[PDB]
Design a binder for this molecule. Structure first.
Ligand SMILES: Nc1ncnc2c1ncn2[C@@H]1O[C@H](COP(=O)(O)OP(=O)(O)OP(=O)(O)O)[C@@H](O)[C@H]1O
Ligand SMILES: Nc1ncnc2c1ncn2[C@@H]1O[C@H](COP(=O)(O)OP(=O)(O)OP(=O)(O)O)[C@@H](O)[C@H]1O
Ligand SMILES: [Mg+2]
Ligand SMILES: [Mg+2]
Ligand SMILES: [Mg+2]
Ligand SMILES: [Mg+2]
Ligand SMILES: [Zn+2]
Ligand SMILES: [Zn+2]
Lengths: 278, 283
């Protein structure tokens, strides 16, 4: 059982759930780790990738998580990590909040059980990106797309281009054996509308295959990128793919398209070029 | 809750916890997915890597897991995945088994709360490797070393060279930002004594009462690639890696094949290499 902790401790005791994290400080890998408590991350899609991403961030001591998903836990989800069979029937965001709160009571939660692509929900979603930060009225520090479809990815895209919100997009192949993460700083890097998707492998009544392995690798690299981005250590990837068949992890950097369909991406690029010549 | 399933099914329904796995079949990734049920895997060390590894195999529908670990869950483990704070004070193997049985009732478990390295425990451990298969008296299909120290790793090595037991060794650095997996087929690939770990990891290891750091992310990645390798090995799809490293600071994932050292410290590794060379000479 774990009580609420006010300030993160370096103390090497069996009772300190943060001892092996704060250890990164004494070892000079991450010199200001406690900063993790000052950030808020939103996650859209608390499925295969989303849930493990949420677990990882929670165990790390993120200040605040915002979870968006419209689906309930089902037994068909039990091939993937996090959700357990007793949670079948609950909404994903609710199951997630319940477990994660149990795992780390220091983390703030805000959950929303809706589809983000409908008109009314979208206005709300944007409001929560802009105001749902650690301090209310300030924006979230990062948005994480862990949804499984074009429409939703495009929606996050539209929102983030308008707000000028840095986000990361993650995906997993329908054949389960490839995935990727991608960093989107609107104006500075290619937004999701800027180009066709980057693939890392070749090539109506049924479903996509999924493996707990691939989802764990993708969530892993995704959150690793988050930590590196927020805590300013190592090198952030703008794109990191994973091909499970070959054991291959291609990197890339996607530059903005100046005739991008999204007028706001165009505007953000403009703003970036202006800021660049100082 | 989840009901026992006698025969895995492709049927795409919300109540089928195997539907998305058996999808691999009709998508020509894995032609014989159900065969997963026929394998036994032993996991030594049920910590950061082990626990997630165990979970991954459990959800996949592994036939049987043998869990070996001498430690209790502590709040200090709560930085890594799987174990929850209410499990603090339980033995790792006990906590794991309980949770895993909940996650998939179809999987058989044999748990062992002891130190693999002591003289009497070692004998037992070898007995279980040889006989703890899905059918009693038959060996396990794979041993997975998810321990955190040289002594244990070397013990498994000794065991597996003598038994001719294929195993995978996994490790994460004390500084949390690198790790690797290695496939050891005694006589065909390098055993754990064949090459120095400092040398093996020279291109991935970042160099710094300290205690080891650990990250949920890095353990998640290592366990991920480890189990992905197990699945590719047993189910016969994709390319099995004999070594796959991970540097988290620079997103570098080196692979290499490693051939056995003919002057290996392990007399059994050497004997196995002979055995192998003979079998290739009479193929
Ligand atoms: N418009 C949307 N708003 C909110 N969440 C979404 C939206 N679209 C997709 N998601 C969520 O993203 C999650 C990630 O999908 P994942 O494929 O891991 O789960 P799933 O869809 O139930 O699995 P399967 O596709 O095997 O049934 C899902 O939980 C899904 O509900
Ligand atoms: N000889 C051994 N026999 C069985 N299990 C072992 C042996 N040596 C190590 N292990 C187990 O391998 C596991 C993997 O270690 P991990 O570092 O993930 O957890 P931990 O050692 O409790 O954590 P920390 O090092 O942060 O205190 C541990 O649970 C440990 O007890
Ligand atoms: Mg669903
Ligand atoms: Mg889906
Ligand atoms: Mg311990
Ligand atoms: Mg340890
Ligand atoms: Zn664009
Ligand atoms: Zn050897």
């Amino acid at each position: 059982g774990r009580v609420r902790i006010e300030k993160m401790s370096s103390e090497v005791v069996d009772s300190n759930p943060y001892s092996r994290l704060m250890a990164l400080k004494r070892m000079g890998i991450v010199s200001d780790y406690e900063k993790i408590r000052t950030f808020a991350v939103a996650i859209v899609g608390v499925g295969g990738v989303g849930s493990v991403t949420a677990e990882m961030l929670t165990r790390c001591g993120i200040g605040k998580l915002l979870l968006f998903d419209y689906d309930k836990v089902e037994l068909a989800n039990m091939n993937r990590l996090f959700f357990q069979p007793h949670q079948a029937g609950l909404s994903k965001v609710q199951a997630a909040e319940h477990t994660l709160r149990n795992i780390n009571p220091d983390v703030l939660f805000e959950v929303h059980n809706y589809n983000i692509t409908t008109v009314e929900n979208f206005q709300h979603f944007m409001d929560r990106i802009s105001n749902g930060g650690l301090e209310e009225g300030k924006p979230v520090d990062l948005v994480l797309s862990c949804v499984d479809n074009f429409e939703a990815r495009m929606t996050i895209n539209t929102a983030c281009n308008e707000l000028g919100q840095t986000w990361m997009e993650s995906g997993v192949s329908e054949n389960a054996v490839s995935g990727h993460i991608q960093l989107i700083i609107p104006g500075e890097s290619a937004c999701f509308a800027c180009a066709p998707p980057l693939v890392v492998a070749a090539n109506e009544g049924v479903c996509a295959a999924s493996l707990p392995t691939t989802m764990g690798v993708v969530a892993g690299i995704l959150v690793q990128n988050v930590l590196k981005f927020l805590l300013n250590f190592g090198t952030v990837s703008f794109y990191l793919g994973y091909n499970a068949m070959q054991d291959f992890f291609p990197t890339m950097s996607m530059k903005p398209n100046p005739q991008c369909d999204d007028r706001n991406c165009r505007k953000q690029q403009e703003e970036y070029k202006k800021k660049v010549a100082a």
